[PDB]
Enzyme design. Structure first.
Site, mmCIF file in Angstrom:
data_model
loop_
_atom_site.group_PDB
_atom_site.id
_atom_site.type_symbol
_atom_site.label_atom_id
_atom_site.label_comp_id
_atom_site.label_asym_id
_atom_site.label_seq_id
_atom_site.Cartn_x
_atom_site.Cartn_y
_atom_site.Cartn_z
ATOM 1 N N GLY A 91 12.236 -34.924 -7.016
ATOM 2 C CA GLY A 91 12.549 -34.907 -8.434
ATOM 3 C C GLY A 91 13.616 -33.873 -8.757
ATOM 4 O O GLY A 91 13.736 -32.860 -8.067
ATOM 5 N N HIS A 144 6.462 -32.965 -14.857
ATOM 6 C CA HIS A 144 7.160 -31.803 -14.319
ATOM 7 C C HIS A 144 8.635 -31.849 -14.715
ATOM 8 O O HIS A 144 9.174 -30.890 -15.264
ATOM 9 C CB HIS A 144 7.027 -31.802 -12.792
ATOM 10 C CG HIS A 144 7.724 -30.664 -12.111
ATOM 11 N ND1 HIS A 144 7.044 -29.588 -11.581
ATOM 12 C CD2 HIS A 144 9.029 -30.473 -11.804
ATOM 13 C CE1 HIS A 144 7.900 -28.786 -10.970
ATOM 14 N NE2 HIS A 144 9.110 -29.301 -11.090
ATOM 15 N N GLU A 145 9.289 -32.972 -14.449
ATOM 16 C CA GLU A 145 10.700 -33.085 -14.775
ATOM 17 C C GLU A 145 10.960 -32.981 -16.275
ATOM 18 O O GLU A 145 11.918 -32.333 -16.690
ATOM 19 C CB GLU A 145 11.279 -34.388 -14.220
ATOM 20 C CG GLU A 145 11.316 -34.454 -12.698
ATOM 21 C CD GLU A 145 11.871 -33.195 -12.053
ATOM 22 O OE1 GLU A 145 12.784 -32.571 -12.633
ATOM 23 O OE2 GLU A 145 11.404 -32.836 -10.950
ATOM 24 N N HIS A 171 11.158 -29.529 -17.555
ATOM 25 C CA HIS A 171 12.458 -28.905 -17.317
ATOM 26 C C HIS A 171 13.404 -29.095 -18.497
ATOM 27 O O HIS A 171 14.151 -28.185 -18.850
ATOM 28 C CB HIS A 171 13.119 -29.485 -16.068
ATOM 29 C CG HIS A 171 12.703 -28.810 -14.801
ATOM 30 N ND1 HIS A 171 12.791 -27.446 -14.629
ATOM 31 C CD2 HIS A 171 12.199 -29.306 -13.648
ATOM 32 C CE1 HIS A 171 12.360 -27.130 -13.421
ATOM 33 N NE2 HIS A 171 11.995 -28.240 -12.806
ATOM 34 N N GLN A 173 18.711 -28.215 -13.756
ATOM 35 C CA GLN A 173 18.564 -27.629 -12.435
ATOM 36 C C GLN A 173 19.921 -27.549 -11.725
ATOM 37 O O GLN A 173 20.057 -26.876 -10.712
ATOM 38 C CB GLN A 173 17.550 -28.424 -11.613
ATOM 39 C CG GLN A 173 16.104 -28.153 -12.024
ATOM 40 C CD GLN A 173 15.103 -28.895 -11.166
ATOM 41 O OE1 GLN A 173 14.923 -30.097 -11.306
ATOM 42 N NE2 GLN A 173 14.453 -28.175 -10.259
ATOM 43 N N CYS A 213 8.908 -27.059 -6.508
ATOM 44 C CA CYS A 213 10.086 -27.252 -7.352
ATOM 45 C C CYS A 213 11.337 -26.720 -6.663
ATOM 46 O O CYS A 213 11.334 -25.606 -6.140
ATOM 47 C CB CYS A 213 9.899 -26.535 -8.694
ATOM 48 S SG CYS A 213 11.295 -26.730 -9.859
ATOM 49 N N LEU A 214 12.405 -27.515 -6.657
ATOM 50 C CA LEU A 214 13.651 -27.086 -6.032
ATOM 51 C C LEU A 214 14.205 -25.807 -6.664
ATOM 52 O O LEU A 214 14.976 -25.082 -6.031
ATOM 53 C CB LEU A 214 14.700 -28.199 -6.102
ATOM 54 C CG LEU A 214 14.401 -29.412 -5.213
ATOM 55 C CD1 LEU A 214 15.529 -30.427 -5.321
ATOM 56 C CD2 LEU A 214 14.229 -28.962 -3.777
HETATM 57 CO CO LIG Z 1 11.206 -28.855 -10.905
#
Ligand SMILES: [Co+2]
Length: 163
Positions: free
Chosen positions: A45, A137-138, A141, A50, A95-96
């Site tokens: 994701g 989650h996304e 963000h 991000q 998470c990235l």
């Molecule tokens: Co994330």
């Protein structure tokens, strides 16, 4: 092209992204770069902020049975909005933008969202389990929220420790 991923504790990640209005070639290139960047860092994701783009759009590509990801199953969610929400479950997340840390977060077990694809076509999607988790989650963000923000008092300490 590859894009630089932004890591915690950058304030950029606290940005509130804006609705997408132009569904053009420039938006499509951003989505392509987002996909190229997500796969290169082995993520499932990725939200626009991000990579420094304060736009309300994200991508999700879950690996299937074979365990591999297929660009064909990639969801491009733009201007998403929750229609309905239900249940409750704990799910360990990563998470990235927070490499190396994984913790259980409380999420709705079932959700229904409305959004637009890269061609501005309205879509409705019902999800549960992993997909429902990725969606929540996304979307967090887009509102400047990170999963470490949703940790219990106990787990929040475990995070500050592994820091
Ligand atoms: Co994330």
């Amino acid at each position: 092209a590859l894009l630089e991923i932004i890591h915690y504790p950058s304030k950029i990640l606290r940005t509130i992204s804006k609705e997408v209005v132009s569904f053009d070639a420039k938006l499509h290139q951003q989505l392509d770069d987002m996909y190229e960047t997500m796969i290169a860092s082995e993520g499932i994701g990725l939200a626009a902020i991000q990579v420094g783009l304060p736009l309300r759009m994200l991508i999700i590509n879950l690996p299937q049975e074979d365990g591999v990801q297929h660009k064909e199953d990639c969801l491009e969610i733009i201007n998403p909005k929750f229609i309905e929400t239900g249940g409750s479950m704990m799910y360990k997340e990563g998470c990235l933008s927070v490499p190396g840390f994984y913790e259980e977060v409380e999420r709705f077990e079932k959700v229904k969202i409305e959004y637009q694809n890269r061609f501005a076509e309205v879509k409705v999607l019902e999800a549960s389990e992993l997909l429902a988790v990725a969606i929540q989650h996304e979307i967090d963000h887009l509102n400047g929220v990170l999963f470490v923000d949703k940790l219990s008092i106990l787990k929040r300490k475990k995070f500050e420790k592994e820091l």
